[PDB]
Design a protein around this ligand. Sequence first.
Ligand code: NA
Length: 461
Amino acid sequence: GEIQWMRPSKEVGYPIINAPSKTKLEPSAFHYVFEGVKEPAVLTKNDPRLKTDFEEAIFSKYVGNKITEVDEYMKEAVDHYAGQLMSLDINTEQMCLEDAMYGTDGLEALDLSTSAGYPYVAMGKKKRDILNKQTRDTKEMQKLLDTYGINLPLVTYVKDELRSKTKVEQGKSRLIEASSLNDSVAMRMAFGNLYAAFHKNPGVITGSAVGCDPDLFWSKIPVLMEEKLFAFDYTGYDASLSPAWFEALKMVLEKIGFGDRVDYIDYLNHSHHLYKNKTYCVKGGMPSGESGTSIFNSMINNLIIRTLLLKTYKGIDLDHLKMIAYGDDVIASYPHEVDASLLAQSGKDYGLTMTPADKSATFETVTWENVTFLKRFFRADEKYPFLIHPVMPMKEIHESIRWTKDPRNTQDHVRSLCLLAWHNGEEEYNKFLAKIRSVPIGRALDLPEYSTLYDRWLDSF
Ligand code: NA
C-alpha cells in the first residue's frame, strides 16, 4: 500500500470530519489489583506522551508496493485455492438487501454501534435512524443508496485501544478506515452468500477461521493440521498488500462464480480516505479496522502462503498444505518441515514483512506446545484429551481488566474475560476471581465459578 497524494479535503469538495480527541479508556476498579503496562493509544497530534510527529507515525504503515503484476507463482496459487473453494459449492447468487442488512443463516446483521461513515457522519445521521431490527425495513436504506450511490470515501478514525508505552511514544496508533454504510451494504449484497459459506465452513477447505467459536473449534483444528506445523507473524499486513494481491483475489472470485462483481475489490484496492480536514488516495492496502474485510484478508493470506511455497519449494504439493487464516493471523502445516526464515525471505520480494511466530527473535520450529492462533495456545484437557482448550495467557486478560470504556458494561467486560481465563486452569482462574472480589465493584458482579464453566464447556459440544 502507498499513499498517492494527500491534501485539504475542501480542495476536492469534502467537508472536515470531526473525530473524537479524548480516549474513552480510563482506569477501572481493578487498575491497582492487577499488573499491567499498557495505556490508551495516542489519538491526537498534541498528546504529551508523544516523542515523534504523530501524523507521520500513523501513515508510515504504507510501506509502498513492491510488486505490480500477478506473476506465475501467484497464478498457480490462484488456481489451486479457487479449485479448492469450488468443492464447497458456494451459492453465487447476490444477497437481497434485507438479509444483507439484518442478517441470515451464516451472516450476522449489520453492527449498529459502528460508524455509518460518509456522508452520514457529516450530516449527523446515525445507523439507528436508518434501520430497525424489529421491522427489517429496507425502504430507508434503499432510498439512501439511490441518493448517494456507492464508492464513497472511507472515513479514517484512530482506534481507541490499549498500546505499549513504546508504541504510545512512537505515535504508532492503529487506524480504522470505515467504509460508508452504502458500500458495506452493497458489498454484503454482492458477496453475502460467499461470507455465509465461509462462516459456516471454518477449516482447511476455506482456509479461513472467521466466524469460529474457539471453545469448540480448537478441538477440530489438530485433526485438520498436517504433520509439520509452520507459522510467522506479519508486520503491517493490511497496509503492505500490493495491488497485485487484489488482482489475484479477483481471479479467484472470477473462477468461483463472482466475476460478476469483482469491481468491488478495486474499491478496496484503489481507495480514497477522509481524515480530519484532509483527504488522501491510497494505491493498494486493504482498508483496516472493519470486520467486513477479514474474509478477503483471509483469502489473500491463502494466496500468499501458496505463492511463497511455490516460489521457494518448486514441486511442493499444495494439496497437502493445510492452513487456516483469520485475517493476517495463520496456522499452517505440511507433511514435511519447511523453513519459515526462507519463506520470509521470499516474502520481501512480494511486499510482505514476515517475522518469527509470536515475536521470537529467531525462526524456531513450531510445535503443538508453542503454537498460538488468535493469541491462544492449544492444550488437551486433562480429563478428556480429545477436547482441546484454547488457552489465552493471563497477561493479556490482566492488561485488559485494568481499564474501562463504560462502567455500565463492567459486568459484561469482566464476564468476557472470565470466558477466556478459566481455560488457564482452576488454580489460576480462582486467583483471578479472588482478586476481582478484593474490591467493591468486583464483589457486586455475577461471575461463573470454575466447575460451572467446565460443565458448560462439555455441554457445548
Ligand atoms: Na486501498
